[PDB]
Amino acid sequence: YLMKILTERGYSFVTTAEREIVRDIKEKLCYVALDFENEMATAASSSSLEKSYELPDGQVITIGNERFRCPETLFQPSFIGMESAGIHETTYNSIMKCDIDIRKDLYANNVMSGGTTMYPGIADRMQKEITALAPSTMKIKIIAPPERKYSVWIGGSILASLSTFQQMWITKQEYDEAGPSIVHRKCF
C-alpha cells in the first residue's frame, strides 16, 4: 500500500530492491495518528509535517500524509479492499467470546509483540479505541515493552532453559518409528 501511495505522490517503485528501500523508509519515517481527520486537516496546512529522506542515489523524497496513512490500514482494512475488521475490533471480539469473569483480567493485561507494532503512538490509539468500545467503568492498560522485537526468541530461550521442559522434547527414537504424524499428537 505504501508503494501504491508513493506512486500517487509521484515516486515509482516496482522491483524488489525498491521494495527493500520502501521497507526501510517505512521503518524510519512512519507513525500512527491519534485522529485521522485532524491529521488530514493539519496536512492541508502542509508546512510542519513533511519530511525528507535520502535515497542511495542521492535523490531526496518528501513524504507527507503517507507517514500516517499506511499504518491506518491496520485499523481500516477497507483501504486495501479486505472485508474484515481492524486489530481493535478483532481483539474486542476475541475477548468478548471468552468467559465473563476472565474478561476483567484480559482487559487488565494486554501484551503485544512483533515488528509491526513499533510505530510510536500505536499503544495510545489502541488504548483509546478499546476504552471507547469497552464500557467506561473500568481501567484498560496497555503494556509496550521496548524490546518486543525479540520477545519470542527470549521466551523460547527461557522455556528451553526450564528444567521441566528437558523431557518434553521429541527424540529420534520417535521418528525412527512413524511418519511425522507425531508432531501434532504431542509437541504442541
Binding site: 521441566t164 518434553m168 509437541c187
Partner: protein, 207 residues
C-alpha cells in the same frame, strides 16, 4: 494334579510367553503398550494421572500397533528400563488376559540381562510380592536356559554341560561360557550393539 508354574521371558524385543511343561511358546508378542496420553504440557509433575477408569484404557500386543490415536511407547531399552509402571501394566494385562493365571497359586520365573543392576531386580521382586502375592519367584540368566535347550540338537542322552553361548537380543547380545554347570563370573562381557541398531542403519542408508 499339581498346577504347572508359569514361564515368562521378558526383554526389550518380542516378549516370549507360555506355560511350563510344553514344547512351544504359545504367545510371542512385542513389548508395545498403548496409553491414553496426548498433549498435556504439565508432563513432569503429573505424568499421566488419568481421571477415573481411563488409566486402564489401553491395549497391548500386536493389537496395540493398529491404534492410531494413542502412543506406542516401548518400556524397555536394552535391558535397563526408565519407567517401570508401564512394565507393571503390561505384566498385569498379560497375566490376566493372555495367561489367565492367578498369581497367588502359581510360580513365576523371570529372565533379565546379566548387566541388569541389582536395584531393578530388587524393586521388581518387591512389586511382584506386594501386588501379585506370588508364592514363589526365581530369576536367572538366560545363558543356561539356552545351553539346556541346545541338548535337543543331537544326542540328548549324552550329557554335555560344557560350552559357551553368545545370545542375541533386540538391544543386547552377550557372551557367557559354561564349565560343567558352573559359569565364570569375571569372564563375561556386554555388547551394546544388537539387532535393533542394525535396522536403524539400514533405514538410515535407505532413506
Amino acid at each position: 494334579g499339581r498346577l504347572p508354574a508359569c514361564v515368562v521371558d521378558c526383554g526389550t524385543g518380542y516378549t516370549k510367553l507360555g506355560y511350563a511343561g510344553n514344547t512351544e511358546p504359545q504367545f510371542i508378542i512385542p513389548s508395545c503398550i498403548a496409553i491414553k496420553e496426548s498433549a498435556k504440557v504439565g508432563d513432569q509433575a503429573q505424568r499421566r494421572v488419568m481421571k477415573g477408569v481411563d488409566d486402564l484404557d489401553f491395549f497391548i500386543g500386536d493389537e496395540a500397533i493398529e491404534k492410531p490415536t494413542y502412543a506406542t511407547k516401548w518400556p524397555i531399552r536394552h535391558g535397563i528400563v526408565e519407567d517401570w509402571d508401564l512394565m507393571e501394566r503390561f505384566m498385569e494385562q498379560v497375566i490376566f488376559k493372555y495367561l489367565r493365571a492367578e498369581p497367588e497359586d502359581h510360580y513365576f520365573l523371570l529372565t533379565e540381562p546379566p548387566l541388569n543392576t541389582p536395584e531393578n531386580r530388587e524393586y521388581t521382586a518387591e512389586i511382584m510380592f506386594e501386588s501379585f502375592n506370588v508364592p514363589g519367584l526365581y530369576i536367572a540368566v538366560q545363558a543356561v536356559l539356552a545351553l539346556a535347550a541346545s541338548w535337543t540338537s543331537r544326542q540328548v542322552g549324552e550329557r554335555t554341560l560344557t560350552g559357551t553361548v553368545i545370545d542375541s537380543g533386540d538391544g543386547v547380545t552377550h557372551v557367557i561360557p559354561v564349565a560343567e554347570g558352573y559359569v565364570i563370573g569375571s569372564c563375561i562381557k556386554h555388547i551394546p550393539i544388537a539387532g535393533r541398531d542394525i535396522t536403524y542403519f539400514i533405514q538410515q542408508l535407505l532413506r
